[PDB]
Amino acid sequence: EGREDPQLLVRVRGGQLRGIRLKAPGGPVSAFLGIPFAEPPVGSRRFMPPEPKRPWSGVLDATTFQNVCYQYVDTLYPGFEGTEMWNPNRELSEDCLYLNVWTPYPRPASPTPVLIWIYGGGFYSGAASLDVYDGRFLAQVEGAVLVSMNYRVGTFGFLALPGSREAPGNVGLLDQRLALQWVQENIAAFGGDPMSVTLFGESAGAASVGMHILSLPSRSLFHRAVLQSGTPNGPWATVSAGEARRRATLLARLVGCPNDTELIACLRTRPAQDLVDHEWHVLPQESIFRFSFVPVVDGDFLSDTPEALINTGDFQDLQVLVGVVKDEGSYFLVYGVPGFSKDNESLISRAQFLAGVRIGVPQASDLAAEAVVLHYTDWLHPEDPTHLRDAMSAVVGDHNVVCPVAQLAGRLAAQGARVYAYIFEHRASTLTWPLWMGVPHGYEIEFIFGLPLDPSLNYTTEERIFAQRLMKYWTNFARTGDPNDPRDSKSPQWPPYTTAAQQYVSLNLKPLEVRRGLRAQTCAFWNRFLPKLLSAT
Amino acid sequence: EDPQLLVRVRGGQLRGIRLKAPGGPVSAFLGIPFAEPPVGSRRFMPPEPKRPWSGVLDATTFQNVCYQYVDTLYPGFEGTEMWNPNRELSEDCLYLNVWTPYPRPASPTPVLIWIYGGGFYSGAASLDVYDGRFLAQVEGAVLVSMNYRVGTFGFLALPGSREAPGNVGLLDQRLALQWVQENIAAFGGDPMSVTLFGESAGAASVGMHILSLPSRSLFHRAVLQSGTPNGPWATVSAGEARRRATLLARLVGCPGNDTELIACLRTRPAQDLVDHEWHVLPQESIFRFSFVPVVDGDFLSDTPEALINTGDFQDLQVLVGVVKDEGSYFLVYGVPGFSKDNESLISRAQFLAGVRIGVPQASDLAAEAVVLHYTDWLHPEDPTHLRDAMSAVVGDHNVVCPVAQLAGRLAAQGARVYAYIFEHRASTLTWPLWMGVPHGYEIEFIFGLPLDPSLNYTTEERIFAQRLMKYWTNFARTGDPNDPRDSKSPQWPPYTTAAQQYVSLNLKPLEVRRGLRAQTCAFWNRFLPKLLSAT
């Protein structure tokens, strides 16, 4: 060294790092990108829990994002911004267990609360290096230390032969836990406070945050949690051990690997792409919002089902922020329900609605399906194509996100937790999906991370002010367990969600509005009635 | 002797009586026999036409009430006593009443025929709230009402037997309808314009005449207030009617083929049968009645649901409707926690228990479905919400949703259908405020009782009653309740399956609404029948 920026050089447990000085709209931030936190889970380590990264020699260059975990790449609308913004933006590789750190420049004086991001992507996709997860704005404007990790997805992260030693399952969650242990040991070297760590994540990343809440070994690694449009409970975030075994065994057959040791050994000789090319083909029914390889209820990482664990756990110590976007379901309709396209209005027939309910609720018996169709039909206009389109969206969003979130918020609150709930209702002026899709799944993230502050990106001025308000809420929650500004009592206040009052806030361009009941009538259908109907039929 | 009060019908001569209505006199012919008294060997048998008589028969007073249970829940309280028999009880009760204008109509006049309710176990055409003088005087109508047998006497059935074939109380109604055909022209009535109207069990009876071909040639239009032939209480299967009759016979000590069983029942004094009438229901329930019309394959060739689903109604005009709180009345008669004397704020546990009583045929899963649909999950334990939800369950299950189903099926199969909800609560009502507008408390307005200054109704209620009398009689005259001379825009539109328009009847002008509890009635009419079948 000697000629380098002395404020970009840092030592962690594994050796010396060189970061890079990035420009944010209000000034510089420090980024340390591509820090390895595990041994590369390659070859004999495929499907195995991660091992801590062995120390390296010299100064590791941490100025660029590392490889994205090998994954399926979405090809539905090739070249369309609305899909490509989620696709891998670095080389696909099984050598992908790296994390990223953004801090103020120069690094902070006092120990600073840490935010750890866990990306979504249905547990089959995602990367911490995507533009919408850019930590520079929270670091610069709010002074936060922000960490994001890559974790294995798809078969590499979640293929399980439950009870085997060579594929115990949930190793993608163990990747996340190892990054959390890395933060505990090393974040102080960046000025981060290991005693104030807040997890946040969206969709499967939110479900992941919920699983760390529910898994004893993770609970000593963080203090507060944010779950955006996802829950560990609900119909897609976990599978039984029997179902995971069935899916792993079918996938093996499809790639030519007909005793668990021999089966897994043959799988480890298969090229990564061959596994990806058959991943989607093991689902038990025609479905949407269902993913082949997800966390497994193993009796280990998850000692029981999430529903059992949230129904009986002690959460006196927990502060959580949870919420949903306005149109959770619309995104999923164009990836499978006949009649839906991003390129037309998707006005569907009653027949297409019934067929779509079977795909969106693939576990429903005929009676359960008919119950869904009866609840969601508008009986003054039972065949109006616009209502049917919007009802199909609401079926998929309610069943997979809103009512699982309502259930989690209600159970956590009844069990001692401080819960804050929101609905996010603003549609980005820059959104490229059609207007009928409303505010789709995932389109609050760019506002939480403060992308509207980047002048290049063509957001409106009000969207810039809105983004800053949101970053305030999130970082205030990280700092204190309370999204409200300890000062500004003039601005309306965000009350806790309670079982008795069920209050939550609207997040849009106008000041906070408090509302009661998270789709309370409809979610009683999903959360109380439907399980008893399915058990009887 | 007043010649306006002397009439010759086919059976002989009648003397009526001149009555005072607020606007002038009316002619009343009360207590006209239309059948041989159904006594002794004729108990449980179809009625027979009245034999001719000599001289002038005195038709100046109401005749006996058909033998029936007398309600004793709140003795001496007007709200219950107003429905109790106001003449002596007798099985010799097959008489009818005719109100005409004074002087007798110069041209043939549309006829309204009232069929009273009372759950098929009670009722009488002599009740003060069925007083026909106001409709006759103000609207110039000819009004007819008949007594028909109720309880075991009208509906005890050993299906297939010769001595108790079932439905004889409905045959009583039909005989009176044919009497109107043969005789009403002598009073100035027009036998070619006959409108039936009735409430609760009487509306269900009107519906059953719609669905039985021999009655169709006896009337032209129909009004069904707060009751339907379809739905859970108005009929029983042949198998269940046989079970109840056999059980009642067991209870009164009658040991055996149908002939001997019915013979021993015929020896029992009337009160012996009434004493056990209420003891044969298969479950603890409300809004269920032991002896009601039976699907015999004769009067009712199939179930009302099958018949309204397949019938052709292209030349039928129907007016149907409900009151705002169909269910509240029934809660104080069985549901623990409910009383006319306190606000009946109930717990959640009492709500669950009430749903089993109010939907006595529901499985556990179906009862859970009802509870979860009617709970307000924003206030799941609020006593006021739970009370009002209990009322709504009973009213929707038994009246509102069956009415919506009938209106939609009739409209879809060519019928002209007009629909209403009645939302004015009488200023004179004696039931508590939490019961709202209870089952049966639109009748006094249709019949025009507010026009009597002595009953202390408000001036707005007099105006409102006149408006309703005009809807009903305009519908009787034309099949359309809209005034053919009122040219303002508060028009009552026909109910259709597409737009589902109905109107609210209250002190303010007609307002048009769409959808008669469409979402909730879809649960009752579409989902729950599939659920009870499956599990």
Ligand SMILES: COCCOCCOCCOCCOCCOCCOCCO
């Ligand atoms: C406007 O009132 C609607 C009150 O809905 C309560 C919803 O609770 C869920 C309880 O589950 C009941 C089971 O349902 C089966 C479906 O039947 C049709 C529902 O019919 C319309 C619902 O909108």
Ligand SMILES: CCN(/C=C/CNC(=O)c1ccc(C)c([N+](=O)O)c1)CC
């Ligand atoms: C927000 C909606 N997303 C698209 C949803 C539809 N595609 C899938 O569900 C899917 C796709 C591919 C695989 C391998 C898979 N699997 O194995 O689970 C599941 C955005 C990219």
Ligand SMILES: CCN(/C=C/CNC(=O)c1ccc(C)c([N+](=O)O)c1)CC
């Ligand atoms: C509008 C409600 N009415 C009262 C409802 C409760 N009583 C009954 O239902 C009842 C009462 C008696 C008998 C024989 C019977 N049966 O066997 O059919 C049913 C008016 C007072």
Ligand SMILES: *[C@@H]1O[C@H](CO)[C@@H](O)[C@H](O)[C@H]1NC(C)=O
């Ligand atoms: C929209 O487009 C898709 C495919 O292009 C098609 O299947 C669907 O029927 C279309 N919908 C409408 C309403 O045109």
Ligand SMILES: *[C@@H]1O[C@H](CO)[C@@H](O)[C@H](O)[C@H]1NC(C)=O
């Ligand atoms: C923003 O708008 C300008 C047009 O003035 C355009 O040239 C530029 O490419 C846009 N940038 C983005 C990110 O949309």
Ligand SMILES: *[C@@H]1O[C@H](CO)[C@@H](O)[C@H](O)[C@H]1NC(C)=O
């Ligand atoms: C109303 O009174 C009845 C009898 O007096 C009683 O059984 C019932 O519990 C009371 N209801 C309430 C809500 O107190």
Ligand SMILES: *[C@@H]1O[C@H](CO)[C@@H](O)[C@H](O)[C@H]1NC(C)=O
């Ligand atoms: C009407 O009110 C008066 C009291 O001013 C009373 O004397 C009379 O009996 C009341 N009539 C009825 C029918 O209640």
